[PDB]
Amino acid sequence: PRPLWTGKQIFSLIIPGHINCIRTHSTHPDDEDSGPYKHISPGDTKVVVENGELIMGILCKKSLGTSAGSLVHISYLEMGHDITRLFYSNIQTVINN
Amino acid sequence: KEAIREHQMAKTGGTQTDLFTCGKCKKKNCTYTQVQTRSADEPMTTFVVCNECGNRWKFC
Amino acid sequence: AGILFEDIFDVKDIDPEGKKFDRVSRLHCESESFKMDLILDVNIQIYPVDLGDKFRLVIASTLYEDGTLDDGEYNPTDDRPSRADQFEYVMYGKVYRIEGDETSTEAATRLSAYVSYGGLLMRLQGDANNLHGFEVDSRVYLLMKKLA
Ligand SMILES: [Zn+2]
């Protein structure tokens, strides 16, 4: 009925280039991957970034923190320091506003 | 001779949790780890290991 | 045309595991005349849905349905060229996963299509004959209208 956007769309606009990354949220159940609903997540606790867009998942420490394999780490290693600096500034400004 | 079994094992090795059931071999004989105190991002999360099948699953 | 899929579904369960989000409820549906399983996430605040509700589901590649390709950009002022506005709930999303029950030894008999509507996820299972039109990383419009 009315045009509504989602926060994942805006953060996908924030994500630079064509970064591909898979992380998990901190509240991810250990039995979701073994059983059904592996790729159709009930709690949205599996972060999947495909072609620079945030398909699904809830971001947290484990994807945007200072840990190996994070979204920031992959962004650095795939795009460079200039684009990662712009990524940092855009995240902070948009989310703080 | 059976009593000197209990006399000289010692080493205080296992903490004897026996609480978390495994997700791979379904065995509760497990031990937990408490590391990465305070700091900027990482909070204390208990890492539990099952010894028989080697499976590790986060407390979450 | 561009209509990849078209059927009428019946709501069977709403949040069977429990409510995980306030404005979004996950509903499971079984179709008729095709026997299609379906899992869909909808904005329950804007569009209320009850148990036993019947709706017509249309999966379309474009809203114009005249063969005109969409640019994927929000152009609200060009509502002129006769878009499909016969449906109450319209969503936009990208299909990201296609699953097959087969082992890729002889052929494929059933397909699962996973579409993400900006984080609102949807899985549609069934036979490959009605799921042939889905191609990974394509952009897909979802249209529903509740039936009385
Ligand atoms: Zn280990």
Radius of gyration of chain B: 15 Å
Number of strands of chain A: 3
The fraction of residues assigned to DSSP E strands of chain B is 15-25%
The CATH superfamily name of chain A is RNA polymerase Rpb1, domain 3
Total individual domains of chain A: 1
Largest sheet strand order of chain B = 1-2-3
The profile of the biggest β sheet of chain B is: 3 strands, antiparallel
Largest interface: A-C, 22 and 25 residues
How many DSSP-defined strands of chain B?
Answer: 3
Taking the sheet with the most strands of chain A, its summary is:
3 strands, antiparallel
What strand line-up does the widest sheet of chain A have? 1-2-3
* Shape, principal axes of CA atoms of chain A: globular
Question: Which range does the strand content of chain A fall in?
Answer: 5-15%
Structural overview:
The structure is cut from a larger assembly and holds chains A (97 residues), B (60 residues) and C (148 residues). Chain A has 97 residues and is an alpha+beta fold. Chain A has a single domain (1-97), classed as RNA polymerase Rpb1, domain 3 (Enzyme I, Chain A, domain 2), CATH 1.10.274.100. Chain A has four helices and three strands; from the N terminus they run αβββααα. Chain A has helices at residues 7-14, 61-64, 71-79, 81-96; strands spanning 21-24, 46-50, 53-56. Chain B has a three-stranded antiparallel β-sheet, with no helix packed on it. Chain B is mostly beta strands and 60 residues long. Chain C is mainly beta and 148 residues long. Chain C has no helices and eight strands. Classes of the chains: A alpha+beta (97), B mainly beta (60), C mainly beta (148). At the A-C interface, helix 1 and strand 3 of A face strand 5 and strand 7 of C. Zinc ion (ZN) binds at residues 49, 56 of chain B. Chain A: It is found in: Chromosome; Cytoplasm; Nucleus.
